RNA sequence: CCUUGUCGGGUAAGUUCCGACCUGCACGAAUGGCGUAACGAUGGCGGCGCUGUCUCCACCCGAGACUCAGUGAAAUUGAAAUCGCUGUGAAGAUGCAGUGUAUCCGCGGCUAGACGGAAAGACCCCGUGAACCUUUACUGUAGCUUUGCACUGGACUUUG
RNA sequence: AUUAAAAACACAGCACUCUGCAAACACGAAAGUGGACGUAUAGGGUGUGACGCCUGCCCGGUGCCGGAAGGUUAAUUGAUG
RNA sequence: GGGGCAACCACACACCGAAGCUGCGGGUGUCACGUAAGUGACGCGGUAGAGGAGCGUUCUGUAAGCCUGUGAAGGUGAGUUGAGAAGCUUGCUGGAGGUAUCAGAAGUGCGAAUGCUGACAUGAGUAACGACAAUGGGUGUGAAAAACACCCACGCCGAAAGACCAAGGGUUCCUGCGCAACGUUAAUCGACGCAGGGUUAGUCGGUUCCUAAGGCGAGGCUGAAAAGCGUAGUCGA
RNA sequence: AACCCACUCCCGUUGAAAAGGUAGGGGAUGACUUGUGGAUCGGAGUGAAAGGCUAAUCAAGCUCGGAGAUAGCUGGUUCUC
RNA sequence: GUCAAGUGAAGAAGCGCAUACGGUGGAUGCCUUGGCAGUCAGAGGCGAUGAAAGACGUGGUAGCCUGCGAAAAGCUUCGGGGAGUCGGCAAACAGACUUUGAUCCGGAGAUCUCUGAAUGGGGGAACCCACCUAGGAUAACCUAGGUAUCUUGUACUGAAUCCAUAGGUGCAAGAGGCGAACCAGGGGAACUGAAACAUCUAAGUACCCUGAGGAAAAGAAAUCAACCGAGAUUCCCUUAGUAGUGGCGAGCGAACGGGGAUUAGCCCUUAAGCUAUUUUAGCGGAACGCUCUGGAAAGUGCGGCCAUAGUGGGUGAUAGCCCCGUACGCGAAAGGAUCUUUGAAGUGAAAUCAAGUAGGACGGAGCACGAGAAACUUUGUCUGAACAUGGGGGGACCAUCCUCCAAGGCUAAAUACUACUGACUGACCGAUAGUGAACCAGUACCGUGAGGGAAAGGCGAAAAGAACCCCGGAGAGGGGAGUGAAAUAGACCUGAAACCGUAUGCGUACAAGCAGUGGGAGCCUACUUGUUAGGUGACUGCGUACCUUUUGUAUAAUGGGUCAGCGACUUAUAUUCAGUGGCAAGCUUAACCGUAUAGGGUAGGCGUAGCGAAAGCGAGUCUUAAUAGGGCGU
């Protein structure tokens, strides 16, 4: 705001040469390389995204962090019903990977502390390396052959 | 992420003003003078590690020279006397025997005279 | 210009002044030429009266300067434990080399030095710098002016 | 105005020249206003500067005024090839 | 260079003298070795500049983890460890937040720009205290009188240093209560703080009536648009 | 003499004062001085002409935009090995 | 018990160094009522029924903010709820209603002083002087309305002039002003680039006027393509930085063709016209107990429960279960808006057509296109056709083919913007940052004005904000005492550096200089008592600060009074080379769709083959009479 006249004449005053009150050397004058908003986005590839997804899905098997089940189906949208069903497999803090994400299963675990439910195309390369144990079904192991081959 | 540099500037100032204590007046308390007197007092401490070796060698020589005239030689004919023979003794431990162990020094000097140099 | 040209006057002595000579480097007639009474806070010389202007200063009266109580600035400043002399040295030394002198700390005076303080030197040069002025520099333009076509007609005539 | 009060600028007086009124001239995109509710004994411009005695020769250069005979010379026409 | 006599020529040995060389102890680049460092095997003053390898700060992930009222971040000492940037453990102050590890994202590190904004110094308890119209006693009040009030006596203006209208200012006028700040000193005093009070018009100045220069101007002409000029008119002492 | 102006000397220059003061000077019935109110403005006014004045600024004001004008030129550029 | 000679410890006016406490000062740390930029929705205007902006006035006392307007922190009604209340910077008086209409929130109305387009005439904005009409009122007034100019219309009226126009009155309807950006037109610079500068760039950009809308403009072929065809406009991605244009300089730069978003076309202002949901207020809203330390438990322990609501806020320290909230439904007396029926009228479904017109000649503009072989659109001056058996286009020009009906109109959607709202979100700020402004900020102040424009946060969990005593001027300030977890938390969290002091130790009054470094006597205080360590440093050898400019600076060359805060190689889009990765004679998509970081989308680009100015020919091709040589390529 403001700052458009020379305060004190070029030569003859005794103070150093200044031309604007609103300058980076001065008091509240202005940042000299100011940042306006801008995007942050790499572009990896289509093929390169899949080879990373196919490589974390190998060491997930070699470290026994992967539990394949026949079918995972809750019945009523109630959170204390799903807590008991994860007690059968012996698991807590689970990423649940399935393709039939149902409104019984999605309304549950929106309040569980460490349990997250996703689709097989919503699975990103962070959550497969976080969420210490992953729980896939026998439908989701098929669809990785349609996606990744 | 604005970083404000007011806390890691201070640690580097106190590290200078610790090495520069004991100095006169304004060289030990304000920083734009105490930085010059820390660099300058490091150059002198580099030169004087070499000059330490020259100020004792010139002190050992002038003590052998005084002690060996009282027996009947110079310094320079004594060193040729010991190296006609093979005695192989530093200046540091001759100038100990000149002051403290005076009777062992005289038993050295007579052997340089027997070496006849 | 050469030049304090040469000649006379005024002073004990006159590069200025007054009067003439004319050999005008480079006077000259409405960018006027030569005279001229009265007027100039106008330029230059000479004289009477008068005087601390001066030989050469002496003394007295007030307001500051000096001491005591109250209040209390400013420019300046890399840091100081801040002497002289003869050398050296980016070429004129409180600080280097040699050698003489000096017990520690104030107050009143004086200005030789600290290339003393104030001002990015104005003189001088540069910058394919800036301004504003000039003309017969170049390219244009306001304005003024010539001739076509409009607004714009008939009646006779000379003449292609 | 705040380092220059003059020998500078003014001036009464003198001459030259342009202007016949809807004037020359100036300010205005233009309407219009000054000139001037004046009318060549007036109004603009340029130089010299009361008074006295006077103001010499040169029309090649440049400018203005006068003259048209002849030369070149603009758009406009458009024969001919 | 000085004291002083360490002078010149030929000549001989001896000593002295650098960060040079050698000895001993560490470190590192290079190339090989003996596996390119299991280990060898040969080099290192440096500006402009080119190449290699690291520390720290703030925010995000890992972080509903881990540490902390038995005491966090900070501030302040002391010890100790690395070639270095720096790290680590503790004494006191402090009173609620902090971030192993490894990766990202950078407003990412100041002594200097006659740099910018607050604080404090030297000059220095130094110059000055605003016309060379002079004050001297007394009595009073008060915590305290050169400066306040009254008294007595001296001085100074008197075509102003006196009275009054116009501007302009805006409660400075008057009385109780006060004296931290202000006033170039002190103040009990004040044009200074807090609380009250205080301006009376037919005739004096305004408004109302009329106009000068000048302004605005219906209709009207002129102008790309804004707008310009101007008749009736109505404002302007 | 009031009044308007600024010729000389000294003092002042961190002044009492961003142009005064104390002594002396020039005009003082007019080409005078002055109070109130109006008119003329930025390549534009005014000017007895000095490039003078137009709000302590003038060989073309002041302010906000073009605009973070352009600078082969000065100054500065921050932790280790 | 004597002289002479030699030797020299004390003693500090004041200073130096180290430590220990203080004072000044306000940094660092932690914290926020304030900002900042986005995402997704709204709604895009207010005003002659008197606006945006203000002056003055209003409270039981007194200034200022916030509300209101002589009916003045309010009045009347409907609706919601529900026990305290009298706005904020802040005390003692006085009182109103309880269980409902008191505060308090939303809808509708009534009042609405004077200024301001300001509009009855004037003015120095918040002032003065008035009329007219109908009523009321006492030599003095009060109610209630009216009274501006311009447009259009509409009556009445009637000059020179016989008629009848100008002109003049009366009425009706409309407009005027303000607002950040957006859009279309009118007018339109310069600096700067070109290492100077006149063409050209900058640039039809800044600015200045005039219109209108919630968007505008533009639009339904006298259009483009080549003998194949495509059928309105607007916007994004490619063609392509390519053809062109250019003192052929700096530079400026298309189209054809592809891919997407969106999916309507109709015709006469003028032959003869039509132009059913959401929204402003609310309400319900689940689940915890003992035990330690502490001033105070949410923390240590030990168990249980909730869940379509577990990373919210705040409660005396770290809370899913203490408090307010968080996922779904109900709505709503009454208004508003949006889709509908609907009413009129405009929104407007809804008929031709085209004369000073096309073309032409000088002079200019716009086309990417700077008279250039210059087509085409424009219009300032001057001219001028055929009648859809005609016409005009296909980049000088001409014949042949193709393709469209000019001189009259109307149109949604994709699109641009934010002064104003509301939710939300942050690898955004954390009082020298973030708005100029967290604080009574466009204020104080500086200006004749336009205009410029600051500095200013924090006691505690809670005022429990210090009764009482002693010194003092009856004060200021202290010393106690009390509150508190803590007053060195006392009107204020922490509390650093420069600067100034007061104590304690050791050294300095015959000694010359960047004030340090190497050796080193002595003294001191501690520890086992001395290398156990720390503090002073007599004496003595070597020693002319730091930065910048430069062939060189101790330089008498530059700069710096010291401290604490801030203060300088960044971003975006294109492209080249290296490092490390994916697929590989092939690699990869941009817009845009999408349950949206996935998937689709291969248009386009780079490559797999060159030589030539070009046609062209191809592992070869160009030059040439070349098959010879030679250039480039495999």
mmCIF file of N, CA and C (backbone and C1' of nucleotides) in Angstrom, chain E residues 64 69 73-74 93-95 97 104 110 112-116 120 143 219 224-225 235, chain G residues 29-30 122 186-187 209 311 427 474 489 493-495 499 559-560 565-568:
data_model
loop_
_atom_site.group_PDB
_atom_site.id
_atom_site.type_symbol
_atom_site.label_atom_id
_atom_site.label_comp_id
_atom_site.label_asym_id
_atom_site.label_seq_id
_atom_site.Cartn_x
_atom_site.Cartn_y
_atom_site.Cartn_z
ATOM 1 P P A E 64 -1.044 -40.974 13.641
ATOM 2 O "O5'" A E 64 -1.590 -40.738 15.110
ATOM 3 C "C5'" A E 64 -0.866 -41.223 16.230
ATOM 4 C "C4'" A E 64 -1.540 -40.876 17.525
ATOM 5 C "C3'" A E 64 -1.547 -41.999 18.554
ATOM 6 O "O3'" A E 64 -1.490 -41.444 19.865
ATOM 7 C "C1'" A E 64 -3.756 -41.417 18.014
ATOM 8 P P G E 69 7.183 -35.691 34.505
ATOM 9 O "O5'" G E 69 6.884 -34.441 35.421
ATOM 10 C "C5'" G E 69 5.558 -34.170 35.820
ATOM 11 C "C4'" G E 69 5.494 -32.910 36.618
ATOM 12 C "C3'" G E 69 4.352 -32.858 37.603
ATOM 13 O "O3'" G E 69 4.770 -32.182 38.778
ATOM 14 C "C1'" G E 69 4.100 -31.147 35.974
ATOM 15 P P A E 73 13.323 -29.095 26.558
ATOM 16 O "O5'" A E 73 12.672 -27.852 25.822
ATOM 17 C "C5'" A E 73 12.497 -27.857 24.418
ATOM 18 C "C4'" A E 73 11.745 -26.640 23.954
ATOM 19 C "C3'" A E 73 12.518 -25.338 23.957
ATOM 20 O "O3'" A E 73 13.367 -25.183 22.839
ATOM 21 C "C1'" A E 73 10.470 -24.994 25.006
ATOM 22 P P G E 74 14.957 -25.174 23.046
ATOM 23 O "O5'" G E 74 15.207 -23.900 23.948
ATOM 24 C "C5'" G E 74 15.345 -22.633 23.340
ATOM 25 C "C4'" G E 74 14.632 -21.550 24.106
ATOM 26 C "C3'" G E 74 15.512 -20.629 24.907
ATOM 27 O "O3'" G E 74 16.245 -19.713 24.120
ATOM 28 C "C1'" G E 74 13.667 -21.226 26.207
ATOM 29 P P U E 93 16.216 -22.325 40.968
ATOM 30 O "O5'" U E 93 16.259 -21.241 39.809
ATOM 31 C "C5'" U E 93 15.647 -19.972 39.960
ATOM 32 C "C4'" U E 93 15.564 -19.272 38.636
ATOM 33 C "C3'" U E 93 14.221 -19.330 37.937
ATOM 34 O "O3'" U E 93 13.347 -18.303 38.375
ATOM 35 C "C1'" U E 93 15.949 -19.898 36.419
ATOM 36 P P G E 94 11.751 -18.487 38.402
ATOM 37 O "O5'" G E 94 11.386 -19.122 36.998
ATOM 38 C "C5'" G E 94 11.099 -18.294 35.889
ATOM 39 C "C4'" G E 94 10.952 -19.103 34.635
ATOM 40 C "C3'" G E 94 9.723 -19.962 34.578
ATOM 41 O "O3'" G E 94 8.608 -19.220 34.141
ATOM 42 C "C1'" G E 94 11.611 -21.182 33.851
ATOM 43 P P G E 95 7.485 -18.739 35.173
ATOM 44 O "O5'" G E 95 6.272 -19.702 34.859
ATOM 45 C "C5'" G E 95 5.675 -19.692 33.572
ATOM 46 C "C4'" G E 95 5.464 -21.084 33.049
ATOM 47 C "C3'" G E 95 4.216 -21.790 33.552
ATOM 48 O "O3'" G E 95 3.742 -22.645 32.523
ATOM 49 C "C1'" G E 95 6.114 -23.034 34.147
ATOM 50 P P G E 97 1.076 -25.189 25.740
ATOM 51 O "O5'" G E 97 1.728 -25.960 24.510
ATOM 52 C "C5'" G E 97 2.902 -25.495 23.861
ATOM 53 C "C4'" G E 97 4.156 -26.178 24.351
ATOM 54 C "C3'" G E 97 4.873 -27.090 23.388
ATOM 55 O "O3'" G E 97 5.573 -26.412 22.358
ATOM 56 C "C1'" G E 97 4.829 -28.088 25.511
ATOM 57 P P G E 104 14.667 -37.707 -0.483
ATOM 58 O "O5'" G E 104 13.454 -36.858 -1.031
ATOM 59 C "C5'" G E 104 13.051 -35.740 -0.291
ATOM 60 C "C4'" G E 104 11.604 -35.408 -0.469
ATOM 61 C "C3'" G E 104 11.367 -33.915 -0.615
ATOM 62 O "O3'" G E 104 11.657 -33.419 -1.925
ATOM 63 C "C1'" G E 104 10.125 -34.671 1.196
ATOM 64 P P C E 110 22.759 -16.284 10.625
ATOM 65 O "O5'" C E 110 24.030 -15.505 10.101
ATOM 66 C "C5'" C E 110 23.996 -14.098 10.101
ATOM 67 C "C4'" C E 110 25.235 -13.458 9.549
ATOM 68 C "C3'" C E 110 25.448 -12.082 10.139
ATOM 69 O "O3'" C E 110 26.813 -11.706 10.029
ATOM 70 C "C1'" C E 110 24.911 -11.850 7.879
ATOM 71 P P A E 112 26.112 -6.317 8.649
ATOM 72 O "O5'" A E 112 26.912 -5.407 7.631
ATOM 73 C "C5'" A E 112 27.320 -4.121 8.048
ATOM 74 C "C4'" A E 112 28.436 -3.534 7.220
ATOM 75 C "C3'" A E 112 28.155 -3.344 5.739
ATOM 76 O "O3'" A E 112 28.595 -2.035 5.363
ATOM 77 C "C1'" A E 112 30.211 -4.476 6.041
ATOM 78 P P A E 113 27.690 -0.722 5.624
ATOM 79 O "O5'" A E 113 26.955 -0.506 4.246
ATOM 80 C "C5'" A E 113 27.705 -0.434 3.051
ATOM 81 C "C4'" A E 113 26.876 -0.786 1.848
ATOM 82 C "C3'" A E 113 25.640 0.058 1.612
ATOM 83 O "O3'" A E 113 25.987 1.226 0.890
ATOM 84 C "C1'" A E 113 25.193 -2.256 1.240
ATOM 85 P P U E 114 25.281 2.641 1.130
ATOM 86 O "O5'" U E 114 26.438 3.531 1.719
ATOM 87 C "C5'" U E 114 26.998 3.219 2.972
ATOM 88 C "C4'" U E 114 27.078 4.427 3.858
ATOM 89 C "C3'" U E 114 25.777 4.928 4.445
ATOM 90 O "O3'" U E 114 25.392 4.134 5.559
ATOM 91 C "C1'" U E 114 27.074 6.746 3.654
ATOM 92 P P G E 115 24.092 4.422 6.453
ATOM 93 O "O5'" G E 115 23.194 3.124 6.288
ATOM 94 C "C5'" G E 115 23.616 2.038 5.485
ATOM 95 C "C4'" G E 115 22.474 1.425 4.720
ATOM 96 C "C3'" G E 115 21.103 1.505 5.355
ATOM 97 O "O3'" G E 115 20.482 2.758 5.124
ATOM 98 C "C1'" G E 115 21.497 -0.690 4.593
ATOM 99 P P C E 116 19.460 3.385 6.193
ATOM 100 O "O5'" C E 116 18.154 2.496 6.030
ATOM 101 C "C5'" C E 116 16.866 3.039 6.248
ATOM 102 C "C4'" C E 116 15.898 1.964 6.645
ATOM 103 C "C3'" C E 116 15.434 2.001 8.082
ATOM 104 O "O3'" C E 116 14.392 2.932 8.295
ATOM 105 C "C1'" C E 116 16.090 -0.185 7.537
ATOM 106 P P C E 120 17.149 4.169 25.971
ATOM 107 O "O5'" C E 120 18.727 4.069 26.095
ATOM 108 C "C5'" C E 120 19.353 3.187 27.010
ATOM 109 C "C4'" C E 120 20.754 2.845 26.566
ATOM 110 C "C3'" C E 120 21.776 3.958 26.599
ATOM 111 O "O3'" C E 120 22.269 4.298 27.875
ATOM 112 C "C1'" C E 120 21.963 2.831 24.567
ATOM 113 P P A E 143 2.627 22.698 55.772
ATOM 114 O "O5'" A E 143 4.190 22.890 55.978
ATOM 115 C "C5'" A E 143 4.933 22.039 56.835
ATOM 116 C "C4'" A E 143 6.136 21.469 56.128
ATOM 117 C "C3'" A E 143 6.946 22.449 55.301
ATOM 118 O "O3'" A E 143 7.875 23.184 56.079
ATOM 119 C "C1'" A E 143 6.588 20.443 54.083
ATOM 120 P P G E 219 -33.027 23.993 -21.208
ATOM 121 O "O5'" G E 219 -33.002 25.177 -22.249
ATOM 122 C "C5'" G E 219 -33.569 24.995 -23.526
ATOM 123 C "C4'" G E 219 -34.521 26.098 -23.870
ATOM 124 C "C3'" G E 219 -34.380 26.634 -25.268
ATOM 125 O "O3'" G E 219 -34.910 25.793 -26.264
ATOM 126 C "C1'" G E 219 -34.487 28.437 -23.805
ATOM 127 P P A E 224 -16.661 18.189 -33.772
ATOM 128 O "O5'" A E 224 -16.125 16.908 -33.013
ATOM 129 C "C5'" A E 224 -16.752 16.451 -31.831
ATOM 130 C "C4'" A E 224 -17.044 14.982 -31.876
ATOM 131 C "C3'" A E 224 -17.686 14.429 -30.627
ATOM 132 O "O3'" A E 224 -19.084 14.604 -30.648
ATOM 133 C "C1'" A E 224 -15.882 13.058 -31.257
ATOM 134 P P A E 225 -19.806 15.501 -29.544
ATOM 135 O "O5'" A E 225 -19.702 14.626 -28.240
ATOM 136 C "C5'" A E 225 -20.363 13.383 -28.158
ATOM 137 C "C4'" A E 225 -19.866 12.639 -26.959
ATOM 138 C "C3'" A E 225 -19.869 13.433 -25.672
ATOM 139 O "O3'" A E 225 -21.134 13.529 -25.056
ATOM 140 C "C1'" A E 225 -17.779 12.430 -25.932
ATOM 141 P P C E 235 -31.892 35.257 -5.502
ATOM 142 O "O5'" C E 235 -30.461 34.859 -4.935
ATOM 143 C "C5'" C E 235 -29.388 35.783 -4.873
ATOM 144 C "C4'" C E 235 -28.085 35.131 -5.242
ATOM 145 C "C3'" C E 235 -26.834 35.782 -4.697
ATOM 146 O "O3'" C E 235 -26.572 35.382 -3.365
ATOM 147 C "C1'" C E 235 -26.543 35.306 -6.988
ATOM 148 P P G G 29 11.826 -17.727 18.752
ATOM 149 O "O5'" G G 29 11.231 -18.462 20.025
ATOM 150 C "C5'" G G 29 11.866 -19.604 20.570
ATOM 151 C "C4'" G G 29 11.194 -20.030 21.846
ATOM 152 C "C3'" G G 29 9.711 -20.306 21.750
ATOM 153 O "O3'" G G 29 9.442 -21.604 21.254
ATOM 154 C "C1'" G G 29 10.160 -18.982 23.659
ATOM 155 P P C G 30 8.313 -21.856 20.146
ATOM 156 O "O5'" C G 30 6.951 -21.792 20.959
ATOM 157 C "C5'" C G 30 6.645 -22.752 21.951
ATOM 158 C "C4'" C G 30 5.641 -22.228 22.947
ATOM 159 C "C3'" C G 30 4.308 -21.775 22.408
ATOM 160 O "O3'" C G 30 3.427 -22.811 22.036
ATOM 161 C "C1'" C G 30 5.069 -20.199 23.958
ATOM 162 P P G G 122 -32.522 28.747 -8.103
ATOM 163 O "O5'" G G 122 -31.780 30.028 -7.553
ATOM 164 C "C5'" G G 122 -30.597 29.896 -6.807
ATOM 165 C "C4'" G G 122 -30.578 30.827 -5.633
ATOM 166 C "C3'" G G 122 -29.362 30.673 -4.761
ATOM 167 O "O3'" G G 122 -28.234 31.339 -5.282
ATOM 168 C "C1'" G G 122 -31.271 30.635 -3.409
ATOM 169 P P G G 186 -15.213 2.598 -32.274
ATOM 170 O "O5'" G G 186 -15.287 4.014 -31.555
ATOM 171 C "C5'" G G 186 -16.243 4.986 -31.944
ATOM 172 C "C4'" G G 186 -16.103 6.244 -31.133
ATOM 173 C "C3'" G G 186 -14.704 6.810 -31.042
ATOM 174 O "O3'" G G 186 -14.280 7.495 -32.206
ATOM 175 C "C1'" G G 186 -15.647 6.784 -28.903
ATOM 176 P P G G 187 -12.773 7.322 -32.735
ATOM 177 O "O5'" G G 187 -11.904 8.025 -31.615
ATOM 178 C "C5'" G G 187 -11.991 9.421 -31.421
ATOM 179 C "C4'" G G 187 -11.219 9.852 -30.212
ATOM 180 C "C3'" G G 187 -9.741 9.595 -30.238
ATOM 181 O "O3'" G G 187 -9.020 10.453 -31.091
ATOM 182 C "C1'" G G 187 -10.578 9.044 -28.129
ATOM 183 P P C G 209 -13.370 10.416 -16.981
ATOM 184 O "O5'" C G 209 -14.206 11.013 -18.174
ATOM 185 C "C5'" C G 209 -15.534 10.613 -18.383
ATOM 186 C "C4'" C G 209 -15.887 10.706 -19.832
ATOM 187 C "C3'" C G 209 -17.160 10.002 -20.214
ATOM 188 O "O3'" C G 209 -18.303 10.762 -19.890
ATOM 189 C "C1'" C G 209 -15.475 9.488 -21.776
ATOM 190 P P U G 311 -12.009 -39.220 14.113
ATOM 191 O "O5'" U G 311 -11.622 -37.747 13.656
ATOM 192 C "C5'" U G 311 -10.280 -37.269 13.830
ATOM 193 C "C4'" U G 311 -10.184 -36.444 15.089
ATOM 194 C "C3'" U G 311 -9.775 -34.993 14.882
ATOM 195 O "O3'" U G 311 -10.349 -34.112 15.849
ATOM 196 C "C1'" U G 311 -7.935 -36.331 15.645
ATOM 197 P P A G 427 -1.186 -27.816 2.476
ATOM 198 O "O5'" A G 427 0.314 -27.452 2.834
ATOM 199 C "C5'" A G 427 0.742 -27.208 4.166
ATOM 200 C "C4'" A G 427 2.233 -27.040 4.207
ATOM 201 C "C3'" A G 427 2.880 -26.932 2.839
ATOM 202 O "O3'" A G 427 2.763 -25.676 2.162
ATOM 203 C "C1'" A G 427 3.952 -28.627 4.027
ATOM 204 P P A G 474 2.146 14.425 56.142
ATOM 205 O "O5'" A G 474 1.013 13.316 55.970
ATOM 206 C "C5'" A G 474 -0.179 13.342 56.739
ATOM 207 C "C4'" A G 474 -1.332 13.942 55.971
ATOM 208 C "C3'" A G 474 -1.353 13.704 54.468
ATOM 209 O "O3'" A G 474 -1.921 12.448 54.124
ATOM 210 C "C1'" A G 474 -1.857 15.985 54.963
ATOM 211 P P A G 489 8.998 -14.030 40.386
ATOM 212 O "O5'" A G 489 7.901 -13.089 39.723
ATOM 213 C "C5'" A G 489 6.748 -12.682 40.446
ATOM 214 C "C4'" A G 489 5.577 -12.434 39.531
ATOM 215 C "C3'" A G 489 4.686 -11.265 39.884
ATOM 216 O "O3'" A G 489 5.227 -10.029 39.474
ATOM 217 C "C1'" A G 489 3.364 -13.127 39.293
ATOM 218 P P C G 493 5.348 -9.536 32.626
ATOM 219 O "O5'" C G 493 4.740 -10.993 32.507
ATOM 220 C "C5'" C G 493 4.470 -11.751 33.670
ATOM 221 C "C4'" C G 493 4.479 -13.226 33.385
ATOM 222 C "C3'" C G 493 5.825 -13.819 33.041
ATOM 223 O "O3'" C G 493 6.581 -14.132 34.200
ATOM 224 C "C1'" C G 493 4.207 -14.545 31.476
ATOM 225 P P U G 494 7.976 -13.400 34.489
ATOM 226 O "O5'" U G 494 8.948 -14.048 33.440
ATOM 227 C "C5'" U G 494 9.336 -15.392 33.602
ATOM 228 C "C4'" U G 494 9.792 -15.986 32.309
ATOM 229 C "C3'" U G 494 11.131 -15.510 31.811
ATOM 230 O "O3'" U G 494 12.181 -16.267 32.375
ATOM 231 C "C1'" U G 494 9.540 -15.534 30.045
ATOM 232 P P G G 495 13.168 -15.681 33.491
ATOM 233 O "O5'" G G 495 13.791 -14.387 32.844
ATOM 234 C "C5'" G G 495 14.635 -14.472 31.716
ATOM 235 C "C4'" G G 495 14.502 -13.228 30.902
ATOM 236 C "C3'" G G 495 15.195 -11.986 31.449
ATOM 237 O "O3'" G G 495 16.552 -11.959 31.007
ATOM 238 C "C1'" G G 495 13.028 -11.517 30.519
ATOM 239 P P C G 499 29.191 -1.859 26.155
ATOM 240 O "O5'" C G 499 28.137 -0.894 26.834
ATOM 241 C "C5'" C G 499 27.915 0.416 26.351
ATOM 242 C "C4'" C G 499 26.963 1.148 27.255
ATOM 243 C "C3'" C G 499 27.385 1.226 28.705
ATOM 244 O "O3'" C G 499 28.287 2.275 28.971
ATOM 245 C "C1'" C G 499 25.133 0.534 28.576
ATOM 246 P P G G 559 34.123 6.956 2.746
ATOM 247 O "O5'" G G 559 33.278 5.883 3.532
ATOM 248 C "C5'" G G 559 32.114 5.327 2.966
ATOM 249 C "C4'" G G 559 31.829 3.971 3.548
ATOM 250 C "C3'" G G 559 31.775 3.882 5.060
ATOM 251 O "O3'" G G 559 30.536 4.310 5.592
ATOM 252 C "C1'" G G 559 33.058 2.100 4.202
ATOM 253 P P G G 560 30.445 5.395 6.770
ATOM 254 O "O5'" G G 560 30.158 4.525 8.056
ATOM 255 C "C5'" G G 560 29.225 3.467 8.022
ATOM 256 C "C4'" G G 560 29.664 2.352 8.929
ATOM 257 C "C3'" G G 560 30.154 2.762 10.299
ATOM 258 O "O3'" G G 560 29.098 3.017 11.206
ATOM 259 C "C1'" G G 560 31.582 1.111 9.384
ATOM 260 P P G G 565 19.150 -10.870 17.214
ATOM 261 O "O5'" G G 565 17.594 -10.618 17.058
ATOM 262 C "C5'" G G 565 16.900 -10.985 15.892
ATOM 263 C "C4'" G G 565 15.802 -10.015 15.565
ATOM 264 C "C3'" G G 565 15.509 -9.825 14.098
ATOM 265 O "O3'" G G 565 14.768 -10.874 13.519
ATOM 266 C "C1'" G G 565 15.648 -7.734 15.104
ATOM 267 P P C G 566 15.532 -11.930 12.603
ATOM 268 O "O5'" C G 566 15.307 -11.439 11.123
ATOM 269 C "C5'" C G 566 14.031 -11.470 10.527
ATOM 270 C "C4'" C G 566 13.748 -10.174 9.822
ATOM 271 C "C3'" C G 566 14.338 -9.994 8.441
ATOM 272 O "O3'" C G 566 13.652 -10.677 7.419
ATOM 273 C "C1'" C G 566 14.700 -8.054 9.678
ATOM 274 P P G G 567 14.465 -11.246 6.165
ATOM 275 O "O5'" G G 567 15.339 -10.028 5.643
ATOM 276 C "C5'" G G 567 14.836 -9.115 4.680
ATOM 277 C "C4'" G G 567 15.947 -8.339 4.020
ATOM 278 C "C3'" G G 567 17.002 -9.167 3.320
ATOM 279 O "O3'" G G 567 16.625 -9.543 2.018
ATOM 280 C "C1'" G G 567 18.037 -7.542 4.667
ATOM 281 P P A G 568 16.646 -11.082 1.602
ATOM 282 O "O5'" A G 568 16.523 -11.059 0.024
ATOM 283 C "C5'" A G 568 17.130 -12.070 -0.756
ATOM 284 C "C4'" A G 568 18.113 -11.489 -1.735
ATOM 285 C "C3'" A G 568 19.331 -12.335 -2.032
ATOM 286 O "O3'" A G 568 19.068 -13.281 -3.047
ATOM 287 C "C1'" A G 568 19.974 -10.096 -1.620
#
